[PDB]
Structures are given as C-alpha cells and as structure tokens.
C-alpha cells in the first residue's frame, strides 16, 4: 500500500481509560496494570474490558497510523463512533459502531456480526490502520509482511465523528501483560 503519507500523530486519551490501564507519560503506550490504578470513575470509562480511545477525533479525509502488538496473545484494534457504549457488555460490531480486527485464541478475526476468519500467513507484529472518511472505508495492513493486506470494511456507515480504538486485552494467562504501542511515523 501508499497510506504512509496520510500518517497522523495518536495519542491516548487518559479519561476514556479501564481503570485498570496504565497509559504512559508520552500517551503512546497502553498496557494492563495488576490492579485499579487509584483514578476516578466517570462517564468515559470503558467499564467491562481493558479499553481506551485515542484523543484525535475524525470526520473528514484520510488517516494512517501503526500500532505494535509483539508478544500480545489478545487485542482489538481499529475506530470507532464517538457515542459508543461505554459501561456494560457489549459486542464488536459495526451495528454498534465498531470497526475492529483482533487476536483471540491463536486465531484473528474482522469484527464483522457474526465475525469473519482472517487468513494471515506471518503474525503480525506491527498493525497499519487506514481510515478514509469520504469513501466509507477502515483497512487493516500486516507491516512485518510487507504491509500486506488483513481486512477492508467497505460501505461503512460511520455516523459520527471516528475515534482510534485500542483493546490491550485480558491477562488471565499471565502471558499477555505487553503493551500496545502507537509507533513512530
Ligand atoms: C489480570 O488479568 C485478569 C483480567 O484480564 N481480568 C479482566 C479485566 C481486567 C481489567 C479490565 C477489565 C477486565
């Protein structure tokens, strides 16, 4: 792909947080703390998963950003509205404005409802998201296989302004304490 040069800048938002993240000083790094991490509840907060928004909203043109996920055994990535849901469960679903990918259980999968295999031959360690508002499109890219192509969402029904998404995930194994990481333009 040729997305590079929409490249934006991410940076967490500290206020949309679990209160069990811990977002580093620079707002470029997210991982799961052992416990509460001593903030106060408020309306934000992402109550039942370990999730966090990105500060940039979208509603217009064409963004690009990676994000690192070496090591991790679970995640979601992507956008999404900035009026979804916050407190109680929930599913990953375009219907409930998401647009997300993840590793679960050694298999990725498109946060489609029902959710679609995908086919990735070299486990990525480095994730490209390509969000192009106009066109009603969310790509997915495999940066350590050559920026090959994971998912298109197509015909998108953004409904609102986009917000960059993180799940860092569970650490029931004790195998998935590694943070997500917005990398380097
Ligand atoms: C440390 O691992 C246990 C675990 O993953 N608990 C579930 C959970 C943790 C934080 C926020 C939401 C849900």
């Given at each position: 792909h040729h997305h590079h040069h929409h490249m934006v800048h991410i940076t967490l938002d500290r206020n949309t947080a679990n209160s069990w993240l811990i977002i580093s000083k620079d707002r470029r790094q997210v991982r799961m703390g052992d416990?509460?991490?001593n903030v106060s509840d408020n309306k934000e907060r992402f109550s039942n998963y370990p999730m966090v928004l990105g500060a940039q909203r979208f509603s217009s043109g064409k963004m690009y950003w990676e994000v690192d996920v070496t090591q991790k055994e679970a995640w979601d990535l992507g956008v999404c509205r900035?009026?979804?849901?916050?407190?109680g469960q929930f599913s990953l679903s375009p219907e409930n404005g998401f647009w997300t990918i993840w590793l679960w259980q050694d298999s990725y999968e498109a946060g489609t409802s029902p959710q679609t295999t995908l086919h990735i031959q070299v486990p990525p360690c480095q994730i490209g998201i390509f969000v192009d508002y106009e066109a009603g499109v969310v790509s997915f890219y495999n940066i350590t296989d050559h920026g090959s192509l994971i998912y298109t969402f197509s015909?998108?029904?953004?409904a609102g302004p986009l917000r960059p998404f993180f799940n860092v995930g569970f650490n029931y194994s004790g195998g998935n304490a590694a943070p997500l990481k917005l990398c380097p333009l």
């Open positions: 416990t509460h991490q900035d009026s979804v849901q916050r407190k015909e998108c029904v953004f």
